[PDB]
Amino acid sequence: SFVEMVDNLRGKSGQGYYVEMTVGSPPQTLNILVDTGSSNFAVGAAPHPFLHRYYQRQLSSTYRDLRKGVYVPYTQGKWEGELGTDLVSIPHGPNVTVRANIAAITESDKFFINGSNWEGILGLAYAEIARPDDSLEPFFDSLVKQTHVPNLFSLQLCGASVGGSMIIGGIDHSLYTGSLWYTPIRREWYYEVIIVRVEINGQDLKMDCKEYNYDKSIVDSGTTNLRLPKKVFEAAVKSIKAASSTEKFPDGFWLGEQLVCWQAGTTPWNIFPVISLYLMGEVTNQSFRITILPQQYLRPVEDVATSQDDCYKFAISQSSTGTVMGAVIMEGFYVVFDRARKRIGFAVSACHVHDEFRTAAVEGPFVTLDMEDCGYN
Numbered sequence: 001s002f003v004e005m006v007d008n009l010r011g012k013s014g015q016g017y018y019v020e021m022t023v024g025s026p027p028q029t030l031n032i033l034v035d036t037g038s039s040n041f042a043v044g045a046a047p048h049p050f051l052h053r054y055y056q057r058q059l060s061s062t063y064r065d066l067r068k069g070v071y072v073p074y075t076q077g078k079w080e081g082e083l084g085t086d087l088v089s090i091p092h093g094p095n096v097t098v099r100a101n102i103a104a105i106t107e108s109d110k111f112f113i114n115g116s117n118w119e120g121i122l123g124l125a126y127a128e129i130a131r132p133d134d135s136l137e138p139f140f141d142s143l144v145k146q147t148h149v150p151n152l153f154s155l156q157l158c159g160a161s162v163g164g165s166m167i168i169g170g171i172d173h174s175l176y177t178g179s180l181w182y183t184p185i186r187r188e189w190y191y192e193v194i195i196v197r198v199e200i201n202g203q204d205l206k207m208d209c210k211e212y213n214y215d216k217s218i219v220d221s222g223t224t225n226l227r228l229p230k231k232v233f234e235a236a237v238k239s240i241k242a243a244s245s246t247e248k249f250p251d252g253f254w255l256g257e258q259l260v261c262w263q264a265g266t267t268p269w270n271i272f273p274v275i276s277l278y279l280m281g282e283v284t285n286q287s288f289r290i291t292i293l294p295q296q297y298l299r300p301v302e303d304v305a306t307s308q309d310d311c312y313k314f315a316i317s318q319s320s321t322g323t324v325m326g327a328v329i330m331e332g333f334y335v336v337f338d339r340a341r342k343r344i345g346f347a348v349s350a351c352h353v354h355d356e357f358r359t360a361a362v363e364g365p366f367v368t369l370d371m372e373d374c375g376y377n
């Protein structure tokens with residue numbers, strides 16, 4: 001019955017992936033951004049220039065006020081609203097209805113995106129990072145408690161306008177090839193993992209592996225880019241610059257500001273290196289790696305000019321709050337959030353990214369000593 005959930009995600013490049021949901025009685029249909037990097041379920045509940053529609057509490061006979069305010073500040077963007085509960089369903093999901101916490105967004109800043117087609121956010125991470133506090137039960141915890149849906153879901157985000165799948169309650173084996181490789185969830189707040197080694201074009205960055213996880217590493221479908229701590233970011237940019245010194249780019253390109261362009265069909269993919277992230281495995285001294293193609297961290301963008309060339313933005317950003325494995329990393333992999341077994345699985349997606357001589361990969365096993373020391377304390 002998982003086939004009913006295949007291809008239930010849609011989105012625009014750089015504007016996230018969303019699923020169709022209904023809230024209230026009678027059902028109100030809304031597109032909800034799926035975000036594994038937060039734990040609040042929130043919807044537009046008041047007019048906004050970028051909102052096509054929104055939740056109208058007054059029309060829901062099953063709405064209940066919680067008489068408590070709420071606000072969420074993300075790394076970029078924020079909103080504030082009113083808490084309440086209502087009945088929720090997922091048309092292209094499991095065949096159930098749950099009573100869930102809903103933050104009715106009444107005011108927001110640089111959160112909704114002009115013409116993005118989604119009107120709310122579904123935070124899939126754990127209660128610990130829920131606002132206002134961990135007693136506000138997140139959506140997925142409610143789903144699992146109230147129904148027979150097993151405590152795991154999987155995400156297949158397909159790249160370049162974009163689509164994918166959120167398999168709720170299980171794993172759909174037709175969505176990936178090869179074996180699934182699992183990494184422990186270090187702590188149940190964000191989906192936190194431990195990166196134990198980083199290579200660029202097969203060259204180890206040779207840093208204290210604690211730097212990779214300073215101060216945490218998370219898997220976050222609500223973030224576009226791969227975000228790296230200052231020290232790691234500088235090493236990676238230095239390495240990617242050197243591999244691609246055949247050509248020249250504005251330095252604002254390396255900051256994610258300016259885009260770069262090439263004559264349609266002549267993007268010089270070969271001069272951009274592949275990036276390998278090694279993740280802590282399930283057995284002692286064992287890791288596995290995921291390999292990222294340049295087609296993943298060079299995000300295609302529409303050229304606002306009279307030209308119809310190939311234009312891209314550098315989708316690796318500097319971070320001050322740890323490593324973020326964002327959407328461009330998850331694209332091309334099938335990612336299993338196995339909450340029941342405190343682990344996250346990776347496999348090559350059926351909608352994988354294609355190069356001519358190179359391929360994205362999930363390979364193991366590897367031996368890695370002292371992986372324990374890579375976690376930050």
Ligand SMILES: CC(C)c1cccc(CNCC(O)(O)[C@@H]2C[C@H](C)CCCCCCCCC(=O)N(C)[C@@H](C)C(=O)N2)c1
Binds near residue numbers: 038121
């Ligand atoms: C809420 C708490 C727990 C919290 C606090 C700080 C950091 C985190 C880690 N997760 C951050 C996040 O992924 O949830 C948001 C989601 C977003 C606002 C949701 C709407 C935007 C979706 C499409 C545009 C993506 C551009 C982008 O990449 N962004 C806008 C990053 C910069 C970001 O900030 N994304 C969680």
